[model samples]
Target: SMEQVAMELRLTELTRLLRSVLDQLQDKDPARIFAQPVSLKEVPDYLDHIKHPMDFATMRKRLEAQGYKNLHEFEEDFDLIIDNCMKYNARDTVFYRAAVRLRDQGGVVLRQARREVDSIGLE
Candidate 1:
């Protein structure tokens, strides 16, 4: 349940960011959003379904379903995203959960290469 909840929150945060950026763009329309290029992906696998919490298709659908297809709603949910991201994934469970967490939140910029389960965080 914690893993599920954590993942949901992470997805929510990302959705908010995505919506905000798209909203700010001059294009303004959802149809044109795909024309924009990603600079580089922190989680490239998110572009497909095998990735958990959100693959691109599922995220896009969620955005559309939540009226976030327009961008404005994504901003409101930003903190919810952070809350999800901040959820606990302790030692015993970290192995199964690490990849997903890394894909969602771990970045070379934000964290060291050692993973959470093996890192100083667990000690």
Candidate 2:
């Protein structure tokens, strides 16, 4: 009985160590992670393309004061908002709509980050 108790305690200790390491590993930025902003010229087009019940003009005006002078920063902010939405249990369609706004235009940063990710080689 003592051996069984000790083995269970050992297993729990190992599980905690493994989970702690895995948690740290998960924090590593994923491939295609945000590294740059979206394009300025593409902003209006992206906004125009996406139809939402919310007023774009108000949202656009609010963004002006939010220090998002470039598309990349705007994209980063939007990405964070999307993340917050997910954490708060926002609807799937809401996430999809926000994501679609950056779909094709997210290339600049995606490609940049992907280059670094793909360039990593096994040593």
Candidate 3:
């Protein structure tokens, strides 16, 4: 039943929503992207961690600040990875779920952090 409920999301919706976020992020300025203020490196690294995205400070930081500018940059960065991700079938679903979870819990930073944690792990 739970799996059935989860399945309702569908890969198509995930990709669509993810693209929406990307579009929103891409619309803003790089300097304004952060809700509060964070190093560019921190943003990317935090995003790198999608699995336990909640495990990162970047999420809280973004939530406190209520998001920043730089929409284009985020979209560009995501697309770079998304392009490659498309190569593998069904791989994007994991990222889509993680992204939704992170957004609900904190923001992009934490969302991404969790994704990283859920990913290949620290081999």
Identify the candidate with maximal lDDT: 2
For model 1, residues 36-89, the per-residue Cα lDDT tens digits are 232236546432522123223434456655445323343234323223333422
RMSD to native, candidate 1: 16.7
Candidate 3 residue-wise lDDT, 90-115, digit = tens:
44575444433334433454366336
- Candidate 2 pairs with clashing backbones: 37-72, 38-71, 38-72
Candidate 3 lowest-lDDT run of ten? 51-60
Q: How well does each candidate superpose onto the true structure, as a TM-score?
A: 0.26, 0.25, 0.22
TM-score head-to-head 2 vs 3, winner: 2
What TM-score does candidate 1 reach? 0.26
Per TM-score, what order, best first?
1, 2, 3
Quote the positional error of residue 7 for candidate 3 in Å. 6.5
lDDT of each: 0.37, 0.39, 0.38
Candidate with better lDDT, 2 vs 3: 2
The number of the candidate with the highest TM-score is 1
